[PDB]
Amino acid sequence: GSFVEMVDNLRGKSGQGYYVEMTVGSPPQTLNILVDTGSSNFAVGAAPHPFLHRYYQRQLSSTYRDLRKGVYVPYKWEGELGTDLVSIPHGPNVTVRANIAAITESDKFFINGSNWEGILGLAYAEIARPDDSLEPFFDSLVKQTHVPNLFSLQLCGAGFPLNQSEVLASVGGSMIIGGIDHSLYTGSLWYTPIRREWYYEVIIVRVEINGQDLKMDCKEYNYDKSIVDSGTTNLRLPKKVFEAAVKSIKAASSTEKFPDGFWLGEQLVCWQAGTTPWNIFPVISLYLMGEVTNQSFRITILPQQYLRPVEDVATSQDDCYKFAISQSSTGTVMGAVIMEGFYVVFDRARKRIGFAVSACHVHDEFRTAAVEGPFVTLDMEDCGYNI
Ligand SMILES: CC(C)C[C@@]1(C)NC(=N)N(Cc2cccc(Cl)c2)C1=O
């Protein structure tokens, strides 16, 4: 591990997001910021909010610059654009001038108890609001310093419920800015092409549930796109793929019947402490386009990744979970519960995303997550969707 200063710099969990500490302004104002690979704006609470115990105060920053322009983002948050000096305490030892959307109004954006006060959109300018002229933070970072155009994320799910006090004292993972820390993964890194630079778009070419081919036209797996998004909790799948996957996961786990509410990701299921039947649930393998023609590799996750630990409505001693795979009308989204099984390298410089088994993924004595290759796969270009 060559990036000790950035190792263990994240806190949080899949359901509320993972955040890194940042400072904005002069003198520096400390804020917790959601790491989001699914958006492209650096936006921070800049006014009183019931769920914020701190916010960016522009009038207190001598380096604050007003852009005299508003920004509206309906998902919703509304803000005022400006620039100011930004640093990441547990990151590269550099300070950069970056765009900052000062959030003055929001609805269902700030999560009570998440402990984050802003969001760091790490994707490309193409999806930045109001438009692509608003340079994303990471672009500014790379243009203004010698930091390599690459970052890597190790998101660490605990494998169990973290109460309010625990989630604040627990290490939630690592965001390595400008490099790859070898202590964060085991085995080899396998790279899949970033199909296009907007979201971190990838192409899935095959899906297996316990080794059984879901057998769908691979274009279905990427309809209308597949992205890697730390800002989403669940593994989200295109409606038709979701229906086929749930049918297969139910069949694999058929020795136990679960209520429709469970499969809809709305209700928790509980087992007596320590008796969660991990073994009756299937592993899920996603094959991704490789860097070599006609070559693919696969990432395999366990139910320890797709069943999200949640506290029992009775706070009892049972181990309870929610099914963290859900339907999407906007394509496949490899959310936080999937990222928790792997060390994910966002190699912007080489337009590729790398995957390796995470040193912090949750597993049991019988099965582990995996990243394996190579596999001979034909016509993978046909798996991509074109509007
Ligand atoms: C982290 C959230 C609160 C804020 C935001 C913008 N970031 C994010 N990754 N998503 C999920 C998403 C991805 C792609 C399209 C849409 Cl519409 C939403 C969001 O809604």
Short mmCIF file of C-alpha atoms and ligand atoms in Angstrom, two decimals:
data_model
loop_
_atom_site.label_atom_id
_atom_site.label_comp_id
_atom_site.label_asym_id
_atom_site.label_seq_id
_atom_site.Cartn_x
_atom_site.Cartn_y
_atom_site.Cartn_z
CA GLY A 1 0.00 0.00 0.00
CA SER A 2 1.71 3.15 -1.25
CA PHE A 3 -1.06 5.63 -0.42
CA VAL A 4 -1.30 5.37 3.36
CA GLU A 5 -2.46 8.97 3.75
CA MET A 6 -5.66 8.18 1.85
CA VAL A 7 -6.35 4.66 3.11
CA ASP A 8 -9.39 4.49 5.39
CA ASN A 9 -10.50 8.04 4.55
CA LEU A 10 -14.16 7.09 3.98
CA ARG A 11 -17.14 6.70 6.33
CA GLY A 12 -20.73 5.62 5.75
CA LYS A 13 -22.68 2.64 4.43
CA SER A 14 -24.54 1.51 1.30
CA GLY A 15 -27.95 2.84 2.31
CA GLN A 16 -26.87 6.36 3.24
CA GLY A 17 -23.76 6.67 1.09
CA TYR A 18 -20.00 6.87 1.61
CA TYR A 19 -18.38 10.22 2.30
CA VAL A 20 -14.96 11.83 2.48
CA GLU A 21 -13.93 14.92 4.46
CA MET A 22 -13.17 18.04 2.39
CA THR A 23 -12.54 21.70 3.12
CA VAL A 24 -13.89 24.67 1.19
CA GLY A 25 -12.97 28.34 1.46
CA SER A 26 -10.43 30.51 3.25
CA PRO A 27 -10.09 29.92 6.10
CA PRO A 28 -11.02 26.28 5.45
CA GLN A 29 -14.55 25.12 6.25
CA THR A 30 -14.71 21.39 6.93
CA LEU A 31 -17.56 19.37 5.37
CA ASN A 32 -18.39 15.69 4.86
CA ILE A 33 -18.96 14.99 1.19
CA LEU A 34 -20.78 12.10 -0.49
CA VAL A 35 -18.54 10.29 -3.01
CA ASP A 36 -20.74 9.94 -6.10
CA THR A 37 -19.50 8.38 -9.33
CA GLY A 38 -23.00 8.81 -10.80
CA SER A 39 -23.08 12.63 -11.04
CA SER A 40 -20.72 15.46 -11.99
CA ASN A 41 -21.37 18.39 -9.66
CA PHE A 42 -19.57 19.40 -6.49
CA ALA A 43 -22.52 20.76 -4.48
CA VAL A 44 -22.64 21.61 -0.79
CA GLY A 45 -25.34 22.68 1.63
CA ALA A 46 -24.95 26.46 1.91
CA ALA A 47 -27.93 27.33 4.11
CA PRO A 48 -29.69 26.06 7.29
CA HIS A 49 -31.40 22.67 6.90
CA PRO A 50 -33.04 20.37 9.50
CA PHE A 51 -30.63 17.57 8.55
CA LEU A 52 -27.43 19.64 8.43
CA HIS A 53 -25.42 20.62 11.49
CA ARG A 54 -23.02 22.61 9.32
CA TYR A 55 -22.93 24.23 5.92
CA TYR A 56 -20.79 26.32 3.59
CA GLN A 57 -20.84 30.00 4.56
CA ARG A 58 -19.67 31.92 1.53
CA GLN A 59 -19.56 35.26 3.33
CA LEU A 60 -16.83 33.81 5.55
CA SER A 61 -14.55 32.78 2.69
CA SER A 62 -12.13 35.41 1.43
CA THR A 63 -11.51 33.28 -1.67
CA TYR A 64 -15.17 32.89 -2.58
CA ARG A 65 -16.04 33.96 -6.15
CA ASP A 66 -19.66 34.39 -7.23
CA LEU A 67 -20.49 33.07 -10.72
CA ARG A 68 -23.84 34.94 -10.74
CA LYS A 69 -25.63 31.87 -12.05
CA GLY A 70 -28.18 29.45 -10.64
CA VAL A 71 -28.43 25.69 -11.03
CA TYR A 72 -31.49 23.47 -10.74
CA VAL A 73 -31.13 19.71 -10.27
CA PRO A 74 -34.32 17.62 -10.11
CA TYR A 75 -33.80 13.93 -9.36
CA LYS A 76 -34.00 17.73 -5.95
CA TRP A 77 -31.63 20.53 -5.04
CA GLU A 78 -31.28 24.12 -6.19
CA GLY A 79 -28.24 26.32 -5.77
CA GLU A 80 -25.98 29.23 -6.63
CA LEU A 81 -22.79 28.71 -8.63
CA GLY A 82 -19.38 30.01 -7.58
CA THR A 83 -15.75 28.87 -7.14
CA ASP A 84 -13.51 28.68 -4.10
CA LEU A 85 -10.38 26.85 -2.86
CA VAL A 86 -10.97 23.17 -2.09
CA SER A 87 -8.80 20.55 -0.35
CA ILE A 88 -9.17 16.93 0.78
CA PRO A 89 -7.45 16.56 4.20
CA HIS A 90 -6.92 12.83 3.80
CA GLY A 91 -6.05 13.07 0.15
CA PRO A 92 -3.43 14.58 -2.13
CA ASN A 93 -1.61 17.44 -0.44
CA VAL A 94 -2.90 20.03 -2.89
CA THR A 95 -5.44 22.85 -2.94
CA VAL A 96 -7.43 23.62 -6.07
CA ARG A 97 -9.87 26.25 -7.26
CA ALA A 98 -13.08 24.45 -8.14
CA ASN A 99 -16.68 25.09 -9.04
CA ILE A 100 -19.05 24.82 -6.10
CA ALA A 101 -22.83 24.78 -6.27
CA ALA A 102 -23.97 26.36 -3.00
CA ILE A 103 -27.23 24.56 -2.21
CA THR A 104 -29.82 27.02 -0.96
CA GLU A 105 -32.93 24.88 -1.40
CA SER A 106 -33.48 21.12 -1.40
CA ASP A 107 -36.20 18.48 -1.23
CA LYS A 108 -35.47 14.89 -0.14
CA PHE A 109 -31.76 15.43 -0.83
CA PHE A 110 -30.16 15.61 2.62
CA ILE A 111 -30.57 12.36 4.57
CA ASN A 112 -31.23 12.58 8.31
CA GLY A 113 -28.24 10.97 10.02
CA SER A 114 -26.05 10.37 6.94
CA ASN A 115 -23.56 12.86 8.37
CA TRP A 116 -22.79 14.27 4.89
CA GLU A 117 -23.33 17.90 3.91
CA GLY A 118 -22.58 17.85 0.21
CA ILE A 119 -21.90 15.67 -2.82
CA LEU A 120 -18.79 15.13 -4.95
CA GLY A 121 -19.82 14.22 -8.49
CA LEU A 122 -16.91 12.28 -9.94
CA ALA A 123 -18.33 11.54 -13.40
CA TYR A 124 -17.72 13.55 -16.58
CA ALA A 125 -18.65 17.08 -17.66
CA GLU A 126 -21.20 15.78 -20.16
CA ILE A 127 -23.68 15.22 -17.35
CA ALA A 128 -22.76 18.22 -15.24
CA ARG A 129 -25.56 20.74 -14.54
CA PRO A 130 -26.48 23.24 -15.92
CA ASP A 131 -24.33 22.04 -18.81
CA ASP A 132 -20.92 20.66 -19.75
CA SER A 133 -19.19 24.03 -19.39
CA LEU A 134 -19.21 23.67 -15.60
CA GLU A 135 -15.88 21.87 -15.05
CA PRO A 136 -16.22 18.92 -12.60
CA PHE A 137 -14.01 18.85 -9.51
CA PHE A 138 -11.78 16.00 -10.61
CA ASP A 139 -11.10 17.69 -13.95
CA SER A 140 -10.02 20.82 -12.08
CA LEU A 141 -7.84 18.75 -9.76
CA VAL A 142 -6.00 17.12 -12.64
CA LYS A 143 -5.63 20.29 -14.68
CA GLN A 144 -4.26 22.29 -11.76
CA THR A 145 -1.88 19.78 -10.16
CA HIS A 146 0.30 16.77 -10.94
CA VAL A 147 -2.24 14.31 -9.56
CA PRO A 148 -2.62 11.33 -11.99
CA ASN A 149 -5.97 11.28 -13.83
CA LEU A 150 -7.24 8.28 -11.85
CA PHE A 151 -8.98 7.47 -8.58
CA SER A 152 -9.91 4.20 -6.91
CA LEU A 153 -12.65 3.25 -4.47
CA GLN A 154 -12.78 0.60 -1.80
CA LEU A 155 -16.27 0.79 -0.23
CA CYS A 156 -16.52 -1.34 2.91
CA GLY A 157 -19.90 -2.67 4.03
CA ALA A 158 -19.72 -3.91 7.63
CA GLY A 159 -21.82 -7.02 7.04
CA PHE A 160 -24.06 -5.97 9.93
CA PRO A 161 -26.11 -2.95 11.12
CA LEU A 162 -24.14 0.09 12.29
CA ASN A 163 -26.00 2.30 14.77
CA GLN A 164 -25.58 6.08 14.74
CA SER A 165 -22.56 6.04 17.05
CA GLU A 166 -20.89 3.16 15.28
CA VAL A 167 -21.20 4.53 11.77
CA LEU A 168 -19.46 7.70 12.94
CA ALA A 169 -16.56 5.80 14.50
CA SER A 170 -16.23 3.13 11.84
CA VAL A 171 -13.92 3.15 8.82
CA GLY A 172 -16.14 2.83 5.75
CA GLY A 173 -13.46 2.45 3.12
CA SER A 174 -10.90 4.23 1.00
CA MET A 175 -10.84 6.76 -1.82
CA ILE A 176 -7.36 6.80 -3.32
CA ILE A 177 -6.94 9.97 -5.40
CA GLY A 178 -4.35 9.61 -8.15
CA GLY A 179 -3.41 5.99 -7.65
CA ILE A 180 -4.00 2.33 -6.82
CA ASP A 181 -3.18 1.08 -3.33
CA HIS A 182 -2.29 -2.61 -3.46
CA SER A 183 -3.26 -3.33 0.15
CA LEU A 184 -6.93 -2.81 -0.67
CA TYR A 185 -7.45 -5.87 -2.83
CA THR A 186 -6.41 -9.48 -3.34
CA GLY A 187 -5.78 -11.25 -6.61
CA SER A 188 -5.63 -9.48 -9.96
CA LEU A 189 -7.20 -6.35 -11.39
CA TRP A 190 -9.33 -6.88 -14.48
CA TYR A 191 -10.23 -3.94 -16.68
CA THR A 192 -13.37 -3.23 -18.67
CA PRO A 193 -13.59 -0.32 -21.18
CA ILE A 194 -15.33 2.92 -20.21
CA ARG A 195 -17.68 2.83 -23.22
CA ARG A 196 -18.27 6.58 -23.30
CA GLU A 197 -17.26 9.40 -20.95
CA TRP A 198 -20.42 10.80 -19.35
CA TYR A 199 -21.46 8.37 -16.63
CA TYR A 200 -18.90 5.66 -15.97
CA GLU A 201 -20.56 3.50 -18.61
CA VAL A 202 -19.61 -0.16 -19.09
CA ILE A 203 -20.91 -3.16 -21.06
CA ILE A 204 -22.13 -6.38 -19.42
CA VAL A 205 -21.99 -9.34 -21.83
CA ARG A 206 -23.28 -12.27 -19.75
CA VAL A 207 -25.10 -12.82 -16.46
CA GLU A 208 -25.10 -16.00 -14.34
CA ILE A 209 -26.97 -16.94 -11.15
CA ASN A 210 -25.04 -19.83 -9.54
CA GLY A 211 -23.31 -20.53 -12.82
CA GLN A 212 -26.62 -20.71 -14.68
CA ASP A 213 -26.72 -18.43 -17.71
CA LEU A 214 -29.62 -15.99 -17.45
CA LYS A 215 -29.60 -16.52 -21.23
CA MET A 216 -30.94 -13.10 -22.28
CA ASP A 217 -29.93 -11.10 -25.37
CA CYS A 218 -26.95 -9.24 -23.86
CA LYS A 219 -28.28 -5.95 -25.18
CA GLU A 220 -30.99 -6.35 -22.53
CA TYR A 221 -28.33 -6.15 -19.82
CA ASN A 222 -27.28 -2.70 -21.04
CA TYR A 223 -30.69 -1.21 -21.88
CA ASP A 224 -30.35 1.70 -22.10
CA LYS A 225 -26.93 1.81 -20.43
CA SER A 226 -24.96 0.18 -17.59
CA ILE A 227 -23.07 2.38 -15.13
CA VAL A 228 -20.94 2.12 -11.97
CA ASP A 229 -22.53 4.40 -9.38
CA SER A 230 -21.38 4.81 -5.79
CA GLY A 231 -24.32 7.18 -5.37
CA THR A 232 -26.87 4.38 -5.74
CA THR A 233 -27.40 1.82 -2.98
CA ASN A 234 -28.70 -1.16 -4.97
CA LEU A 235 -27.73 -3.28 -7.89
CA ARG A 236 -30.37 -1.94 -10.28
CA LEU A 237 -31.38 -3.98 -13.33
CA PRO A 238 -33.44 -3.19 -16.49
CA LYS A 239 -37.04 -4.31 -15.89
CA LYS A 240 -36.83 -7.45 -18.04
CA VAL A 241 -33.47 -8.46 -16.59
CA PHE A 242 -34.75 -7.83 -13.06
CA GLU A 243 -37.74 -10.09 -13.65
CA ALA A 244 -35.53 -12.86 -15.02
CA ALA A 245 -32.92 -12.50 -12.29
CA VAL A 246 -35.46 -12.54 -9.48
CA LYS A 247 -37.10 -15.59 -10.97
CA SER A 248 -33.72 -17.32 -10.98
CA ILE A 249 -32.71 -16.16 -7.51
CA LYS A 250 -36.06 -17.37 -6.15
CA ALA A 251 -35.57 -20.74 -7.80
CA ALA A 252 -32.07 -21.06 -6.37
CA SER A 253 -33.28 -20.16 -2.86
CA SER A 254 -36.53 -22.13 -3.11
CA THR A 255 -35.93 -24.10 0.09
CA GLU A 256 -37.19 -20.95 1.86
CA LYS A 257 -40.20 -18.89 0.80
CA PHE A 258 -39.92 -15.10 1.05
CA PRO A 259 -42.83 -12.62 0.87
CA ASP A 260 -43.34 -10.53 -2.26
CA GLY A 261 -42.44 -7.49 -0.19
CA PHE A 262 -38.94 -8.89 0.24
CA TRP A 263 -38.27 -9.35 -3.45
CA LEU A 264 -39.62 -5.84 -4.06
CA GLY A 265 -36.83 -4.59 -1.83
CA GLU A 266 -39.35 -3.00 0.53
CA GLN A 267 -39.47 -5.33 3.51
CA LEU A 268 -36.79 -6.86 5.64
CA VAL A 269 -36.41 -10.55 6.43
CA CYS A 270 -34.85 -11.70 9.67
CA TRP A 271 -33.10 -14.77 11.04
CA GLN A 272 -32.18 -15.73 14.59
CA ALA A 273 -28.73 -14.28 15.40
CA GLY A 274 -26.00 -15.95 13.36
CA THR A 275 -28.29 -18.28 11.42
CA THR A 276 -28.62 -16.35 8.15
CA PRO A 277 -28.75 -19.13 5.50
CA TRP A 278 -26.21 -17.59 3.15
CA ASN A 279 -25.72 -20.93 1.42
CA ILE A 280 -29.26 -21.18 0.06
CA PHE A 281 -28.79 -17.91 -1.85
CA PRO A 282 -26.91 -17.99 -5.18
CA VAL A 283 -23.80 -16.06 -6.20
CA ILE A 284 -24.33 -13.61 -9.08
CA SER A 285 -21.76 -13.22 -11.84
CA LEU A 286 -21.60 -10.26 -14.19
CA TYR A 287 -19.34 -10.72 -17.23
CA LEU A 288 -17.84 -7.49 -18.49
CA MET A 289 -16.19 -6.67 -21.83
CA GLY A 290 -12.42 -7.05 -21.51
CA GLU A 291 -9.65 -4.88 -22.98
CA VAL A 292 -8.67 -7.57 -25.48
CA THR A 293 -10.87 -8.33 -28.50
CA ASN A 294 -13.33 -11.19 -27.89
CA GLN A 295 -12.19 -11.43 -24.28
CA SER A 296 -14.32 -10.94 -21.14
CA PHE A 297 -13.85 -11.39 -17.40
CA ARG A 298 -16.41 -11.85 -14.62
CA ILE A 299 -17.05 -10.34 -11.21
CA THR A 300 -18.93 -12.56 -8.77
CA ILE A 301 -20.83 -11.30 -5.75
CA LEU A 302 -22.30 -13.14 -2.82
CA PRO A 303 -25.60 -12.69 -1.01
CA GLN A 304 -23.44 -10.98 1.63
CA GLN A 305 -23.28 -8.18 -0.93
CA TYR A 306 -26.82 -8.21 -2.32
CA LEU A 307 -28.63 -8.63 1.05
CA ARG A 308 -28.23 -5.27 2.85
CA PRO A 309 -27.90 -5.38 6.67
CA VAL A 310 -30.71 -3.44 8.35
CA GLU A 311 -31.67 -3.02 11.98
CA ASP A 312 -34.74 -5.00 13.01
CA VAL A 313 -37.78 -2.79 13.58
CA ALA A 314 -37.56 -4.26 17.10
CA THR A 315 -33.80 -3.71 17.45
CA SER A 316 -33.85 -7.33 18.63
CA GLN A 317 -30.93 -9.71 18.29
CA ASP A 318 -31.98 -11.05 14.90
CA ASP A 319 -29.84 -10.52 11.80
CA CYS A 320 -32.09 -8.78 9.26
CA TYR A 321 -31.62 -7.69 5.65
CA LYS A 322 -33.35 -6.07 2.70
CA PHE A 323 -33.01 -7.48 -0.83
CA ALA A 324 -30.71 -4.91 -2.51
CA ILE A 325 -31.44 -5.68 -6.15
CA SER A 326 -34.17 -3.61 -7.75
CA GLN A 327 -35.84 -2.69 -11.01
CA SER A 328 -34.56 0.16 -13.19
CA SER A 329 -36.09 2.02 -16.15
CA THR A 330 -32.77 3.79 -16.76
CA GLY A 331 -30.43 0.85 -17.32
CA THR A 332 -28.19 -1.25 -15.09
CA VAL A 333 -26.70 0.52 -12.10
CA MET A 334 -23.87 -1.17 -10.22
CA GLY A 335 -24.51 0.54 -6.92
CA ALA A 336 -22.78 0.51 -3.59
CA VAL A 337 -23.77 -3.00 -2.57
CA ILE A 338 -22.00 -4.32 -5.68
CA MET A 339 -19.02 -2.00 -5.22
CA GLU A 340 -18.64 -3.31 -1.66
CA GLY A 341 -17.38 -6.58 -3.00
CA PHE A 342 -14.59 -5.02 -5.03
CA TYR A 343 -11.76 -2.54 -5.19
CA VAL A 344 -12.84 -0.42 -8.18
CA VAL A 345 -10.28 1.56 -10.20
CA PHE A 346 -11.59 4.51 -12.22
CA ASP A 347 -8.72 4.86 -14.68
CA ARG A 348 -9.83 7.94 -16.56
CA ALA A 349 -6.40 8.29 -18.13
CA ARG A 350 -6.81 4.95 -19.88
CA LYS A 351 -10.60 5.10 -20.24
CA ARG A 352 -11.09 1.87 -18.29
CA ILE A 353 -12.53 0.63 -15.01
CA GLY A 354 -10.67 -2.02 -13.05
CA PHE A 355 -12.12 -4.59 -10.65
CA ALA A 356 -10.38 -6.74 -8.05
CA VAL A 357 -11.69 -8.67 -5.04
CA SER A 358 -11.95 -6.30 -2.08
CA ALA A 359 -9.80 -6.81 1.00
CA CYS A 360 -12.91 -5.74 2.95
CA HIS A 361 -15.73 -7.64 1.22
CA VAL A 362 -18.00 -9.61 3.54
CA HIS A 363 -18.06 -13.37 3.00
CA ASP A 364 -18.23 -16.73 4.78
CA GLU A 365 -15.86 -19.69 5.17
CA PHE A 366 -17.29 -21.38 2.08
CA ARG A 367 -17.51 -18.71 -0.61
CA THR A 368 -15.73 -15.49 -1.54
CA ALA A 369 -16.38 -12.75 -4.09
CA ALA A 370 -14.27 -13.17 -7.23
CA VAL A 371 -12.83 -11.43 -10.28
CA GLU A 372 -11.85 -14.02 -12.86
CA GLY A 373 -10.73 -14.17 -16.45
CA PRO A 374 -10.29 -14.42 -19.31
CA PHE A 375 -13.29 -15.86 -21.16
CA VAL A 376 -13.78 -16.07 -24.90
CA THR A 377 -16.80 -13.90 -25.71
CA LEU A 378 -17.97 -12.99 -29.22
CA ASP A 379 -19.74 -9.94 -30.66
CA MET A 380 -19.55 -8.02 -27.40
CA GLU A 381 -20.00 -4.77 -29.30
CA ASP A 382 -23.58 -5.85 -30.00
CA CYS A 383 -24.29 -5.85 -26.28
CA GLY A 384 -24.16 -2.08 -26.19
CA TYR A 385 -27.37 -0.13 -26.62
CA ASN A 386 -27.79 2.65 -29.19
CA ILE A 387 -30.80 5.00 -28.90
C1 LIG B 1 -26.75 10.35 -4.55
C2 LIG B 1 -28.05 11.05 -4.93
C3 LIG B 1 -28.82 11.53 -3.71
C4 LIG B 1 -27.80 12.19 -5.92
C5 LIG B 1 -27.55 11.70 -7.35
C6 LIG B 1 -27.61 12.83 -8.40
N1 LIG B 1 -26.29 10.97 -7.45
C7 LIG B 1 -26.59 9.74 -7.90
N2 LIG B 1 -25.69 8.79 -8.13
N3 LIG B 1 -27.91 9.54 -8.11
C8 LIG B 1 -28.51 8.33 -8.66
C9 LIG B 1 -28.90 8.53 -10.11
C10 LIG B 1 -28.07 8.02 -11.15
C11 LIG B 1 -28.42 8.25 -12.51
C12 LIG B 1 -29.60 8.98 -12.84
C13 LIG B 1 -30.43 9.48 -11.80
CL1 LIG B 1 -31.87 10.37 -12.18
C14 LIG B 1 -30.09 9.25 -10.43
C15 LIG B 1 -28.58 10.65 -7.75
O1 LIG B 1 -29.80 10.82 -7.75
#
